[PDB]
């Protein structure tokens, strides 16, 4: 029944019926306007309730800030007779804590404005941008003088669509210190949701029940649902992702934030007014000398051969714990490479690289070992970022099986790679040269042109056993028959014989010859490593 | 100064406050940026604690952290042989350009 | 005293103390407080008013 | 067998004719032997590819388990364009070794080596990076530090900056009517201890 | 003094590790090594067949 509560879809038609089905007769949607009532009904403290709802707008003083770190209130929309309940969450942006006491986004029914207080007093104005000072980045302005510790309203911000009001950087404090100098003094990324009151209560009911039973933070759960749909609904995919977060955390001894990335979510950036976001702890504690932020969307080269690298690459490198060469390998493995061997600094791309480092770290693999093992996997040829939401857990569990097996059988990553890789030297090694020289005097074109692959294996068996250090000639025969079935370079056992009986008339049939011998050596070494008996083979 | 809760609780190093206080006074007199002051200090000669080439000092500290006594550089003579005698001194001792 | 009767007696005293005290109140004024400047809080006009 | 048949050209010698017997060539032989042993089972095949002139950077990287980017940059920084003999391979490995020691790349090591103090006249000249090139170099070096080590570096920089800024203030700024001559005098004026 | 003896014991264990390294290498540089044996019974098995 709790599963039905969590997963049933909520529409404007059945909202009233669902509320009556989910709450007592003496409970009305207006009860959700009191934070104290919600605390009593759900058995939470007021501080715990504010992790969901933040601060309720109930006519405070004019400065007062409005974020803890969320803002919410009921607003009867004054274009008609509907009553909406909205919620805005903020993620502070580079250099917010120097200058800016607070940078608050306010909602009034279909349009938004800004409220600001400042640390340092300056005599000039401030233009609130949204893009990287682009031609179409201006979304509002603050008329000065911008003195410190003073409230300032901003003129009904305009140039922002409602679709980007979900995950859209509403902010830039392009504040002038002189008549010709301005800098981005900080801000935050704002996310907006609006619902009718009854629907808002039903969604809050889902979130509290799921957080209480799973132990997730309200914002950790919020990030998980944000990685499946924009509407913030709970469904099978979200619940499955929650399970893997709990399961990975127990198994790999990971924090809920690290396990969250492993399940397929982005790095969490939310801060709780007395804590540090997962993103900031990874990349900005301490900062190189300034703050790296994903709220850039800019293009940076991760080419190792690049003269005069970027600050963004250096900060990214230190956060992942890798050097220039390993970062390039992760870019190819993730498939996040772009024109000129560049990446886009977003949460999605950065989380893709961090997910790979987590995948290698929890399995005691280096970055290079992760690349080698992935090549032998049935996932090779597919970039990890271009993997379905069902394939990613399959990759993780596959990596667990192999690494656990290798430790159990005491086989190193290099050893298992040499046993299974299709990559071969392409050179006729001295072992192969000695095999051919010892084989020619005991072989004839008549035997090679016969039809009995069973008889050809018997003739070749003693020579193969000698060159591969096999136990008995009988073992070499079955290795040869296994190789004949595989047809490595298109060569069969008879085709191998005819290539041996050539007066060095090998133009590039050597490629087939060495590939045939490469597979044979792998099969023989695999049998020896497993210590397989001749009867089983 | 804002009498905010964060300004009462948030931990910070005393040197950070002292450095930003001095930085404000220096940049106010010279009119330039904080980064402009750093470049200017890299060639200032009329003091005993200057010239201060901070990026060079950072590089030397990184080397000192990873390998003091230069054992790794000593054990690979092919790469040490391509450095100048004065430049090697700049690794072991603080000598800006 | 660690005995069952002693623990029951101890529980009785604590419950009686808690019923005399009542429910402890929440923090009411901290979140509505607007942060002033140092000179603003020390302003003579604010004190005089 | 391979060394003698090839006239010891496989081993090579720095500025010397190959095949000599002395303590230096014996030392090279010992180090070359250590490399062959570490190669594992493909060692015999790799040695044969080295007797011929068909040993490539890609083959060397995969056999030794190194990253191809590191080997490529090491070759460029060392100045070798072909792996002809052990001397070339040994030189490449040394650039890789110091790159790992400083937690950086061979290209960065080459940049550091190219910083030359040659007195800037009275002889040819000195070769130094620009201010922006210095800042880029510092970021690359600092990116190889752990979080614990980065915090230690930050503490050193803060202490150095405090003494530098105080000395600049003492020599350049004298306030309206106050005479201050010491770090403690700066303490008593600015009401915060910079020491 | 006890610390010195314990440190010497570490050096004793390291020496024993190098001794087994020399034993294994000597086994491989032997004239009658694995390679010689493998080719001889390989040749003789073909002759016997």
């Amino acid at each position: 029944e709790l599963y039905n509560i969590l997963t049933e879809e909520i529409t404007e038609k059945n909202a009233d019926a669902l509320f009556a089905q989910n709450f007592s007769e003496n409970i009305t949607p207006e009860n959700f306007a009191s934070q104290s009532w919600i605390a009593k009904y759900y058995g939470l403290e007021l501080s715990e309730v504010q992790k969901y709802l933040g601060m309720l707008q109930n006519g405070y003083s004019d400065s007062t800030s409005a974020y803890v770190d969320n803002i919410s209130t009921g607003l009867v929309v004054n274009n008609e007779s509907k009553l909406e309940a909205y919620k805005i969450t903020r993620v502070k942006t580079d250099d917010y804590d120097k200058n800016i006491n607070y940078f608050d986004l306010m909602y009034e029914g279909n349009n938004q404005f800004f409220i600001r207080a400042n640390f340092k007093v300056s005599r000039e104005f401030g233009a609130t941008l949204r893009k990287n000072a682009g031609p179409s980045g201006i979304v509002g302005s603050l008329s000065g003088p911008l003195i410190a510790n003073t409230n300032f309203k901003s003129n009904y911000l305009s140039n922002i669509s409602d679709s980007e009001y979900k995950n859209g950087v509403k902010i830039y404090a392009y504040r002038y210190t002189s008549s010709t100098s301005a800098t981005n003094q900080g801000g935050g990324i704002f996310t907006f949701e609006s619902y009718p009151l009854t629907i808002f209560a039903l969604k809050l009911n889902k979130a509290i029940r799921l957080c209480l039973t799973s132990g997730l933070s309200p914002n950790e759960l919020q990030t998980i649902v944000r990685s499946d749909n924009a509407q913030g609904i709970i469904n099978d995919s979200v619940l499955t992702k929650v399970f893997y977060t709990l399961f990975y955390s127990h198994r790999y001894a990971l924090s809920f934030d690290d396990a969250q990335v492993l399940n397929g979510s982005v790095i969490n950036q939310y801060a709780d007014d007395d804590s540090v976001s997962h993103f900031n702890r990874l990349f900005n504690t301490p900062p190189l000398k300034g703050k790296i932020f994903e709220a850039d969307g800019n293009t940076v080269s991760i080419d190792p051969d690049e003269e005069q690298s970027t600050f963004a690459r250096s900060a990214l490198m230190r956060g992942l714990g890798v050097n220039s060469g390993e970062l390039y390998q992760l870019g190819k493995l993730a498939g996040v490479l772009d024109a000129q061997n560049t990446i886009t600094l977003s949460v999605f791309v950065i989380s893709s690289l961090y997910r790979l480092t987590l995948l290698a770290r929890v399995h005691q693999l280096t970055v290079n070992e992760l690349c080698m093992l992935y090549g032998l996997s049935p996932f090779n040829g597919k970039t990890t970022a271009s993997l379905s939401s069902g394939e990613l857990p399959r990759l993780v569990i596959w990596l667990y099986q192999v690494t656990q097996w290798l430790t159990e059988a005491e086989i190193t990553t290099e050893a298992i790679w040499l046993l299974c890789t299709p990559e071969f030297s392409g050179n006729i090694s001295p072992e192969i040269s000695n095999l051919l020289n010892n084989l020619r005097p005991s072989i004839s074109e008549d035997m090679a042109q016969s039809h009995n692959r069973e008889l050809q294996a018997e003739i070749l068996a003693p020579f193969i056993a000698a060159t591969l250090h096999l136990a008995s000639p009988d073992m070499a025969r079955y290795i040869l028959l296994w190789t004949d079935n595989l047809r490595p370079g298109g060569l069969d056992i008879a085709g191998f014989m005819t290539l041996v009986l050539k007066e060095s008339l090998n133009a590039n049939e050597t490629t087939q010859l060495v590939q045939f011998c490469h597979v044979m050596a792998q099969l023989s070494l695999s049998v020896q490593t497993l210590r397989l008996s001749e009867a089983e083979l | 100064l804002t009498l905010s809760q964060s300004n009462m609780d948030t931990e910070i190093s005393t040197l950070t406050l002292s450095n930003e206080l001095l930085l404000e006074h220096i940049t106010r007199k010279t009119g330039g940026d904080s980064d402009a002051l750093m470049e200017s200090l890299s060639t200032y000669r009329q003091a005993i604690d200057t010239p201060y080439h901070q990026p060079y000092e950072t590089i030397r500290q990184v080397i000192m952290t990873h390998d003091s006594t230069l054992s790794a550089l000593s054990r690979n003579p092919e790469v040490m042989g391509q450095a100048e005698g004065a430049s090697l001194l700049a690794i072991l001792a603080n000598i800006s350009p | 005293e660690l005995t069952r009767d002693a623990l029951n007696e101890a529980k009785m005293w604590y419950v009686r103390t808690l019923e005399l005290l009542g429910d402890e109140p929440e923090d009411y004024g901290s979140q509505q407080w607007a942060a002033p400047s140092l000179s603003g809080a020390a302003s003579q006009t604010v004190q005089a008013a | 067998s391979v060394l003698v048949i090839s006239g010891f050209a496989v081993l090579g010698a720095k500025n010397q004719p190959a095949g000599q017997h002395n303590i230096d060539t014996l030392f090279s032989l010992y180090r070359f032997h250590q490399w062959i042993n570490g190669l594992g089972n493909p060692g015999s095949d790799t040695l044969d590819m080295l007797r011929q002139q068909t040993l490539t950077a890609d083959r060397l990287a995969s056999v030794m388990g190194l990253d191809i980017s590191m080997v490529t940059q090491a070759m460029v920084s060392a100045g070798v364009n072909q792996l002809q003999c052990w001397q070339d391979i040994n030189t490449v490995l040394q650039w890789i070794d110091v790159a790992s020691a400083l937690h950086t790349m061979p290209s960065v090591i080459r940049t550091l080596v190219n910083i030359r103090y040659v007195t800037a006249l009275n002889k040819a000249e000195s070769n130094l990076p620009s201010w922006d090139e210095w800042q880029t170099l510092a970021e690359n070096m600092e990116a190889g530090l752990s979080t614990q080590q980065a915090q230690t570096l930050a503490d050193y920089t803060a202490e150095r900056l405090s003494s530098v800024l105080c000395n600049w203030f003492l020599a350049n700024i004298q306030p309206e009517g106050v005479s201050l001559h010491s770090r403690d005098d700066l303490y008593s004026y600015f009401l915060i201890d910079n020491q | 003094i006890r610390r010195e003896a314990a440190q010497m014991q570490v050096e004793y264990q390291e020496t024993q590790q190098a001794h087994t390294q020399a034993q294994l290498e000597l086994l491989q540089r032997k004239f009658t090594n694995k390679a010689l044996y493998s080719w001889m019974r390989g040749k003789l098995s073909a002759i016997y067949y």
Side-chain angles (χ1 to χ4, degrees), chain A residues 285-289 304-305 307-315 317-318 322-326 328-329 368 372 414 417-418 423-425 427-431 525, chain D residues 41-42 44-45 48-49 52 54 59 62-67 69-70 72-73 103-105 107 111 132-133 135-136 139-140 142-147 150-151 154:
Chain A
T285 52
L288 212 54
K289 69 268 180 192
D305 309 330
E307 203 89 49
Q308 311 298 328
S309 59
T310 321
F311 164 81
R313 195 187 85 177
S314 297
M317 258 162 66
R318 195 189 76 176
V322 300
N323 51 38
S324 191
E326 297 160 6
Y328 188 69
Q329 295 196 79
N368 196 236
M372 289 185 258
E414 192 97 286
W417 186 75
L418 289 178
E423 298 189 347
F424 57 78
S425 157
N427 182 260
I428 295 188
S429 77
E431 335 278 348
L525 201 49
Chain D
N41 239 27
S44 312
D45 189 37
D48 202 62
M49 288 188 84
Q52 313 161 246
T54 84
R59 193 39 186 175
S62 86
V63 158
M64 299 190 60
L66 300 155
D67 175 36
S69 290
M70 286 218 54
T72 284
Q73 297 189 357
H103 282 92
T104 185
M105 295 274 102
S107 304
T111 312
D132 287 335
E133 287 171 341
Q135 277 188 348
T136 300
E139 300 168 9
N140 267 307
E142 172 167 355
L145 300 176
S146 61
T147 87
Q151 198 58 64

Side-chain angles (χ1 to χ4, degrees), chain A residues 34-54 208 212 218, chain C residues 24-27 31:
Chain A
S34 162
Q35 294 193 341
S36 72
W37 178 92
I38 300 185
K40 268 218 175 280
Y41 182 80
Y42 290 104
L44 305 161
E45 293 283 344
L46 268 89
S47 83
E48 283 170 349
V49 164
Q50 286 183 142
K51 310 281 142 61
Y52 303 88
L53 290 179
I208 292 183
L212 281 188
Chain C
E24 84 166 300
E26 303 278 5
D27 189 317
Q31 288 176 182

Side-chain angles (χ1 to χ4, degrees), chain A residues 500-520:
Chain A
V500 174
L501 282 157
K502 269 172 162 284
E503 315 168 280
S504 297
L505 278 295
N506 273 7
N508 266 66
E509 328 163 303
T510 81
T511 306
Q512 328 185 10
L513 176 63
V514 306
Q515 187 170 17
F516 182 92
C517 288
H518 169 81
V519 170
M520 216 173 55

